Amino acid sequence: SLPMLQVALDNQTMDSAYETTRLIAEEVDIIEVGTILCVGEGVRAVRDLKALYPHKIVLADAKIADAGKILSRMCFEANADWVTVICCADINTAKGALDVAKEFNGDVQIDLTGYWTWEQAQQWRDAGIGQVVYHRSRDAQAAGVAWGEADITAIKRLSDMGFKVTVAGGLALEDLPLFKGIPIHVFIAGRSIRDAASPVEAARQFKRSIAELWG
Amino acid sequence: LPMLQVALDNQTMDSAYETTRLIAEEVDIIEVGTILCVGEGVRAVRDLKALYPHKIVLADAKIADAGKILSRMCFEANADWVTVICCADINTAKGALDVAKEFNGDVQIDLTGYWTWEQAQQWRDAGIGQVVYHRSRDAQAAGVAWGEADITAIKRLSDMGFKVTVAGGLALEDLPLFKGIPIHVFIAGRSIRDAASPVEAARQFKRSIAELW
Ligand SMILES: [Mg+2]
Ligand SMILES: [Mg+2]
């Protein structure tokens, strides 16, 4: 199978986000309401984007740290398909978000930005979490942290634990070959699509490269 | 004396105002809870500071990454303080703190969930002066109580030089557990908002803090 492409809408306002979606909504598989757009506009962003693009998967990247049931329910009532819970959260937070998700036929991903352990990863699997976002912090990226050997190893180990792994964090087109041969579920691109001279062509380039690399 | 922070974990502004119109003048710090940040977005911060410009307004964003952008959105909305979640890369706390400094605001590391003493030393070396020792609401709902290990950890954080806020389902009866520790702030959300008398609930917290400290 080919890795899917997720666009991150890390825009501060809905009209900024629409400037991207009007160009690339049909060029990508998943539309992410980024954490920045969740904070800028609140959960209406989820409701509105799903109303515009009801045939697409809409992910609310809320990076829930606690109050798993309440915050997941807000996102799902706004018609989210998927929500994110941050890796450090108490296990009951992921569990709570998962129970709500099942009411709505949605799903939960654990976002792996920052500091987590393999013991925690086992708890997620035991709790019934099936997706994780292996995620380089943009702030670490800005401080020179590059994709590398240890990432490939960890991504493979997560996959062998039975998770579908999404990869994210300042991904550029030139980074995709690093991941060749690994059954990546989804690649997320925010800035490398939204900020391109032609977002459409940026998205199509990611799709072509993926098709070549995983074909 | 430890200050009293009310958490506005409400889905909509009008729900938050049901609380604030009762207790805004009864507390020291008004928190835009994470639930309100997600429900309404940063407008919540801008609106509540406009209403209560004399009170400290905390945006409980629990930032996980993009420290500079997300803190700047909160501080442009006139937040005084913002939270960063404990698992965030150290450069996220640093980014948020650099922005905070431009606005004469501050950053707290929220300690909900899994973190390490090595990370705590990193926050200190980065110039972080505030943490929120925080029992997860979901852990609370699964039966996790405040205990001596929490008290030991709070004292340890205080000895490292942090001003410590305590939070997580706090009830009036919990206050004596922390006696003798120079707690900076106690947060109460449910035990004030959902009280039969929110005004009595806030006054009782302040009365008890004044007695104990
Ligand atoms: Mg995101
Ligand atoms: Mg809070």
* Helix-strand topology string of chain A: EHEHHEHEHEHEHHEEHH
Beta percentage of chain A is 15-25%
The protein's oligomeric status is homodimer
Rg of chain A from C-alpha positions? 16 Å
The distinct bound ligands, ions and cofactors come out as:
magnesium ion
CATH class of chain A: Alpha Beta
Number of strands of chain A: 8
Largest interface: pair, residues per side = A-B, 44 and 46 residues
State the secondary-structure class of chain A: alpha/beta
Protein name (chain B): 3-keto-L-gulonate-6-phosphate decarboxylase UlaD
Family (chain B): Belongs to the HPS/KGPDC family. KGPDC subfamily.
Cofactor (chain B): Mg(2+)
Subunit structure (chain B): Homodimer.
Descriptive overview:
Two copies of one chain form a homodimer. By secondary structure, chain A is α/β, with parallel strands linked by helices. Chain A has a single domain, classed as Aldolase class I (TIM Barrel, Alpha-Beta Barrel). Chain A is 45% helix and 20% strand. Chain A has ten helices and eight strands. In chain A, strands 1-2-3-4-5-6-7-8 form an eight-stranded parallel beta barrel, surrounded by seven helices. In chain A, strand 4, helix 5 and strand 5 form a beta-alpha-beta unit. The first copy, chain A, is globular and about 45 Å long. At the A-B interface, helix 2, helix 4, helix 5 and helix 7 of A face helix 2, helix 4, helix 5 and helix 7 of B. Bound molecules: magnesium ion (2 copies).
